Write a protein that binds this ligand. Structure first.
Ligand SMILES: [K+]
Ligand SMILES: [K+]
Lengths: 289, 293
C-alpha cells in the first residue's frame, strides 16, 4: 500500500526538490541541504531498505532557540536534512488522503490555505453578529499530545503498519510546529514537513465536534477561535469545548490564557481586530509586536 | 449563461436578492444621496421595478461616487469613492454574473479582489520564486487605475467576452461615475473594502491582458489589482523585463507608469501588500512580514 507510494522514484524526487527549495538550518548531524543530493546518490537505496524493514532510525531534532522581540524565546526543532526529506516524502502521500477529511475552516499548514483566509472567515462571522470570541489557548501540541492516542486516530485511516511505524518514530524524534506565524511572518516553516499535518489529523476531531455543535469557528494548527453571539453562550462554549479537548483528545487547555472577549481584545495569527466606523465593520490588521 | 443575453440574468429575482443580501452584509458608508444600507430594502420595494426597466433601456443614471476621507489606523488619511447603496446593489448584481465568467479566464497568480484569494497567497508565491533564485525584483509602479484607464480601451477588452450591449452600456456609465479601488490592503488591512463591488473586477479584466503577456514571456510574477512584482534571476534580465513590460503596459493597455517610483531592487527593498521581505539567517531563506508603517 502506502509505503511503496512514499518510496517511489517520482515521490522521492519531488520530496528532494522541495527540501532543497526549502533550504533551512542543519540538524544534529551537521549536514547541509547542499549535501543531500550526493548523500542520497550514495545512500538512498540503503535508506529505502531500512525504511522498508522498519530499521531506519530518525535522528532527534536539533533544538534551536530564537529571540522574540518581546523578550520571550521561540523554540524550534530542526530535523536533519535527511529526515526533512523523508518527512516530506511521507507528507506528500498523506496530505491528499487527509485533505478529503478536513474541515473548510481549518487553515494552518494546508495546501493553498493561509492565515489571512482564517482572518477573513472570522471577520465575516463577527460582522454577522457573532462578536463574542472564545479564545481557547492550548499548551504546545507536541509537548503534550499522547503518542498512543495520536497514532490510534491516524490508524483509523492509515492501515499500512510500515507507515504507522515511521510516523511514530518521527513523533519520538521531537518534530514540532514552527509558530513564527504568531509574529505575522509568512514563509516556509522550519522543521514542518510532517508535524503540522499530524497535529491537524488530531485536531480535525475537534473540528468535527464543533461542527456537531453548529459552532462558528476558524482554526490554524492548534490555534482556534470560536465566534458566538452572546457572552452567556460564549461562556458555555468555553466550558464545553475545553472539556472536550482535555477529556477526548487528551490535550491541555491553559485556562488562565484562554478567555472570552470582544474582537478588540483578540490577538490571532499576528492580527488584531478593530471596528472600522466608516465601513461599520470589524476589520483586522497586524497587531503591535 | 449566454454572454449576448446577460442583462436578464443580472436582473433576475434570484440574482437581485443575492446582490441585495451581499450589499447589506457589506454595510459601508452612505453615498451622495445619504441613503443608509438599512434603507435599501424599502427603496427597492418602491423603485426596484423602475430601476430594472431603466436598465433595460439604458436610462438608469448612476450617481457620482461620494468622496469620503477616513483615518488610516497608523496615521494619515485614506480617500474612498463611495457609490450610493443603490449603485452598490446594481454593481454587485452585475459583478455576480460577470465574476464566474472571468474567473475561468484569469491567471492563477492574480490574487486581488477575487473569491478565496488574498494578499498572503501572493506573498507566498513570490517567496517561492525568490527562494528559487529569482531575487531581482521588477517593481513597476502604476498610477491609480481608475484615475488613468482609457474607458474605450477597457470597454473594448470587456466586449471581447461580453456581447450584451446593455451590460456594456451600464458598465461604462459606472466608470464615469467614479468607481475606484479601496487600497487599504497596502496597510496590511484585511476586511470588506468599500466601494468595490465592481471596480476591482474591471481592473482585473484589463490587467488580465498583462498577465497573459507575462505568461507568454515565461515570467515569474504575482499581481494584486494594479500592483504587480516580477521575480527575475539577474539584474540584466530585470532591466530587460522592466523595459519590455513597462512598454507593453503603456502602449498596449494605455496605463501610466510612474517613472520615479518604478525600480528594479532586491527583496529587502520591496514593500508589497503591506509586507516587507527579509533574509532569515537561520533558515537561509527569504521570508516576509509586515513592513514598518
Ligand atoms: K486560540
Ligand atoms: K508594483
Amino acid at each position: 500500500s502506502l509505503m511503496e507510494q512514499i518510496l517511489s522514484n517520482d515521490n522521492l524526487n519531488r520530496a528532494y526538490l522541495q527540501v532543497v527549495r526549502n533550504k533551512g538550518a542543519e540538524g544534529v548531524d551537521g549536514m547541509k541541504y547542499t549535501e543531500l543530493k550526493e548523500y542520497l546518490a550514495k545512500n538512498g537505496e540503503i535508506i529505502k531498505e531500512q525504511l522498508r524493514i522498519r530499521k531506519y532510525k530518525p535522528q532527534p531534532v536539533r533544538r534551536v532557540e530564537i529571540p522574540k522581540p518581546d523578550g520571550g524565546v521561540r523554540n524550534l526543532g530542526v530535523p536533519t536534512v535527511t529526515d526533512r526529506f523523508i518527512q516530506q516524502a511521507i507528507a506528500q502521500v498523506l496530505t491528499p488522503i487527509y485533505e478529503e477529511q478536513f474541515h473548510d475552516h481549518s487553515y494552518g499548514f494546508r495546501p493553498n490555505r493561509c492565515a489571512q483566509q482564517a482572518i477573513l472567515t472570522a471577520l465575516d462571522m463577527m460582522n454577522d453578529g457573532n462578536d463574542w470570541i472564545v479564545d481557547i489557548d492550548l499548551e504546545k501540541f507536541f509537548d503534550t499530545v499522547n503518542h498512543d492516542k495520536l497514532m490510534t486516530i491516524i490508524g483509523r485511516t492509515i492501515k499500512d503498519g510500515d507507515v504507522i511505524s515511521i510516523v511514530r518514530k518521527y513523533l519520538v524524534s521531537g518534530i514540532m510546529i514552527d509558530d513564527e506565524y504568531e509574529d505575522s511572518i509568512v514563509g516556509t516553516p522550519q522543521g514542518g514537513n510532517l508535524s503540522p499535518l499530524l497535529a491537524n489529523i488530531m485536531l480535525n476531531e475537534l473540528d468535527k465536534e464543533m461542527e456537531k455543535r453548529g459552532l462558528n469557528f476558524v482554526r490554524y494548527a492548534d490555534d482556534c477561535i470560536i465566534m458566538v453571539g452572546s457572552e452567556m453562550s460564549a461562556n458555555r462554549v468555553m466550558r464545553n469545548i475545553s472539556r472536550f479537548i482535555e477529556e477526548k483528545l487528551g490535550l491541555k487547555v491553559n485556562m488562565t490564557k484562554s478567555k472570552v472577549d470582544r474582537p478588540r481584545g483578540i490577538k490571532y495569527l499576528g492580527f488584531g481586530f478593530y471596528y472600522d466606523t466608516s465601513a461599520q465593520q470589524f476589520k483586522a490588521k497586524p497587531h503591535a509586536k
